[PDB]
Write a protein that holds these residues in place. Structure first.
Motif, short mmCIF file in Angstrom:
data_model
loop_
_atom_site.label_atom_id
_atom_site.label_comp_id
_atom_site.label_asym_id
_atom_site.label_seq_id
_atom_site.Cartn_x
_atom_site.Cartn_y
_atom_site.Cartn_z
N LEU A 285 0.85 -1.18 0.00
CA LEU A 285 0.00 0.00 0.00
C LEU A 285 0.89 1.24 0.00
CD1 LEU A 285 -3.24 0.55 2.01
CD2 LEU A 285 -1.45 2.27 2.19
N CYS A 286 0.56 2.20 -0.86
CA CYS A 286 1.31 3.45 -0.86
C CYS A 286 0.48 4.57 -1.46
CB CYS A 286 2.64 3.32 -1.61
SG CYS A 286 2.47 2.90 -3.35
N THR A 287 0.76 5.79 -0.99
CA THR A 287 0.05 6.99 -1.41
C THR A 287 1.01 7.94 -2.11
OG1 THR A 287 0.44 8.07 0.72
CG2 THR A 287 -1.59 6.80 0.48
N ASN A 288 0.48 8.72 -3.05
CA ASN A 288 1.24 9.73 -3.78
C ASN A 288 0.49 11.06 -3.72
OD1 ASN A 288 3.09 11.05 -5.35
ND2 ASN A 288 2.75 9.83 -7.21
N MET A 330 6.44 -1.69 -3.84
CA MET A 330 5.56 -1.13 -4.85
C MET A 330 5.49 0.38 -4.68
SD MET A 330 2.76 -0.12 -6.45
CE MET A 330 1.57 0.17 -5.15
N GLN A 331 5.98 1.13 -5.66
CA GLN A 331 6.24 2.55 -5.43
C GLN A 331 6.17 3.33 -6.73
OE1 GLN A 331 10.19 3.43 -4.01
NE2 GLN A 331 9.85 5.65 -4.13
N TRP A 332 5.74 4.59 -6.62
CA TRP A 332 5.78 5.54 -7.72
C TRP A 332 7.17 6.17 -7.84
CZ3 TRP A 332 1.03 5.63 -4.88
CH2 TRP A 332 -0.10 5.32 -5.63
N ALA A 333 7.29 7.14 -8.74
CA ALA A 333 8.50 7.92 -8.87
C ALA A 333 8.47 9.12 -7.92
CB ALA A 333 8.69 8.39 -10.32
#
Length: 379
Positions: A285-288, A330-333
């Protein structure tokens, strides 16, 4: 409506079935990936191989971090006797030996400064300056193996060992504060700007994971003791926690349980809200903030969510095969241009989400980039 396009797929044939580490370039132009197959290679946003390198040892890479200048990658493997600095564009090697034949356990660049901190099982902590390539050792900061650690945006080191202590270091290797003693083990160190009414707050709040069960808070404005945000038994064991906004924590647990709490100290004691996402398991889980999107991975399926209204965004849903298994990273830039998914099976997935199109206007005429291969002029 542009759904998350599957840009490219990569497997463990070049990474290796294991904990796969992918590191973003500081300009989100290069994606370095390395798993367990002693091969470190960098891909572009569209999935083209750019530079590949081979490591001498087969140990699992526990540290793989870029430099600020996007020139060097520091690599430390599992219990490695040394660590390797690799120049990607020169594809050059340099090997730095760990003192006392120590087995490496933690390495980290500073996201703002070309300074590399290295730590081993003996608690000896070395600061490495790249501009002069010099070492500054520190004794007795940790009496056991270093477990977690990172660098602040202002240039502050945080380190935590298995003896349930936290230590802060500065640029000149001067300790900023004594050892931090808390009930249990702090891990997953991160920086937060707590919700303060005045907007002159620096990036110094320490947010950590307490013994894989709770959340650890530390502030420096008034020397308040580190507070332990505990969770109900229905939550279970924590999987991850993410910071979004100006100090808002969203944490996920093993049974698809999510909790959103504002970092406001007065409101930290009581959870602001809690919800149930999944009913079988949860992977990541991750937020941007720049794109303002929440990605939740579980059951080989990635769902998209909002953060303010918490509406379930099913439009941008993407599905993963059963071979993906439990997602481990699991990650964005930095700008959120691309999304990278890696599991413990060596599977690598890339998804395109935002690509904010450029727009310039003449008199009553505008333009939209749309697809990157063309430009649509608009009347």
């Amino acid at each position: 409506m542009a759904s998350s396009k599957k840009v490219f797929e990569f497997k463990d044939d070049l990474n290796g079935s294991g904990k796969v580490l992918f590191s973003w370039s500081q300009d989100c132009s290069y994606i370095a990936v390395c798993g367990q197959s002693k091969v470190v290679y960098v891909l572009d946003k569209r999935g083209r191989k750019l530079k590949e390198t081979v490591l001498k040892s087969k140990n699992k890479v526990i540290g793989l971090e870029w430099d600020k200048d996007q020139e060097f990658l520091a690599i430390l493997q599992e219990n490695s006797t040394c660590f390797l600095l690799w120049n990607v564009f020169q594809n050059s090697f340099e090997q730095q030996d760990l003192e006392e034949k120590s087995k490496g356990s933690f390495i980290k660049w500073s996201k703002t400064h070309p300074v590399l901190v290295i730590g081993t099982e003996k608690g000896i902590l070395y600061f490495y300056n790249k501009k002069t390539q010099k070492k500054i050792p520190t004794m007795g900061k940790h009496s056991k193996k270093i477990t977690t650690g990172d660098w602040n945006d202002e240039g502050l080191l945080i380190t935590g060992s298995e003896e349930k202590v936290l230590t802060v270091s500065s640029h000149n290797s001067d300790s900023k504060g004594e050892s931090i003693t808390v009930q249990h083990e702090p891990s997953n160190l991160q920086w937060a700007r707590q919700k303060t009414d005045d907007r002159d707050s620096s990036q110094r709040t320490i947010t950590a994971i307490l013994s894989n069960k709770s959340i650890l808070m530390y502030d420096l404005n008034t020397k308040k003791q580190p507070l332990e945000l505990v969770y109900e038994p229905k939550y279970g064991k924590i999987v991850d926690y993410q910071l979004f906004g100006d100090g808002y924590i969203v944490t996920g647990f093993t049974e698809g349980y999510v909790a959103h709490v504002s970092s406001h100290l007065y409101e930290l004691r009581d959870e602001i809200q809690s919800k149930r996402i999944f009913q079988s398991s949860l992977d990541a889980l991750c937020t941007n903030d720049i794109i303002y999107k929440l990605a939740v991975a579980g059951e080989n399926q990635i769902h998209i969510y909002n953060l303010g209204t918490w509406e379930e965004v099913k439009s941008q849903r993407i599905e993963l095969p059963k071979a993906a298994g439990n997602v481990t990273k699991m990650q964005w830039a930095n700008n959120g241009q691309l999304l990278v998914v890696a599991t413990a099976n060596g599977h690598l997935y890339g998804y395109l989400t935002s690509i904010p199109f450029l727009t310039s206007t003449y008199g009553s005429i505008v333009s939209v980039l749309s697809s990157f291969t063309e430009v649509s002029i608009v009347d």
